[PDB]
Amino acid sequence: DNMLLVDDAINDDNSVIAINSNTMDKLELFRGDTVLVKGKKRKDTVLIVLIDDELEDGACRINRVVRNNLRIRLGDLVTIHPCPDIKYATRISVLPIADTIEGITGNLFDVFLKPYFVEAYRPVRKGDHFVVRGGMRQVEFKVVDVEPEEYAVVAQDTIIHWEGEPINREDEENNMNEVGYDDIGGCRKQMAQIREMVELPLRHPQLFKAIGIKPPRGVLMYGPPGTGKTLMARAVANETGAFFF
């Protein structure tokens, strides 16, 4: 029962996900418990479980920040598992987003993060984001580094380092290629042929051991220039999740 419908959370917490009481019973959880939620491709995070009777069976509430982090939209499906082993981050470095600090003066740390981390115990993970509203503005922050790794809790013992260059928002997608199967159209048979020969030897390597064969290694794609061959290879590599070179 780890597949739940996505709903727009009313609250303004980026590390809180609401579940139905029947769903909470099925998942065998408690109010305030932290659970790991995995969405599309290889993106996942941790959220604080909340009890919501108004939520219908097989439904959950997540704010827009969580959906953006998981690369999902409203009404999608995610996989939720218990996360009781999450520990406390002894030392975390976090830097603001450049476009969110346009002319904002004063100690951004005390102004924004300190109210947002006064015994909040919000679970954090590498690459996560969270928006904090201070005064009449809102500023986003990203999980630049955490110790111990990977996912932990930002408690009082945590030491926050807010010194570093602003995180320009454009480079997250301009200088990086995060493309999935949804970015490829008009070529389904070729995509299936590539996947059945690339993912299967890696995602499920014990099948070939069971059947006692050595799957083919090399794969030569060719076609007219401009048909997206490089894009197809990038998408397959990203979806597989294995290290790509």
């Binding site: 030392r91 470095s93 580094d145 110790e147 380092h161 570093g164």
Partner: protein
């Protein structure tokens, strides 16, 4: 002797500190060896430093 690594102008310019920083060189929120990577060690005009660790001949 102590001056072969830890002497005058070795503490004024923390060669050990620079060496350890170069070894663990990251923003990230004792022995010196010549297997690693160099780090810039700039000194103003007119200063010489002969405190680099000795290596002895090849025997």
């Amino acid at each position: 002797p102590s001056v072969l690594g830890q002497g005058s102008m070795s503490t004024r310019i923390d060669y050990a500190g620079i060496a350890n920083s170069s070894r663990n060189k990251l923003s990230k929120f004792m022995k010196i060896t010549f297997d690693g990577e160099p780090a810039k060690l700039d000194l103003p005009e007119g200063q010489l430093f002969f405190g680099f660790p000795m290596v002895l001949p090849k025997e």
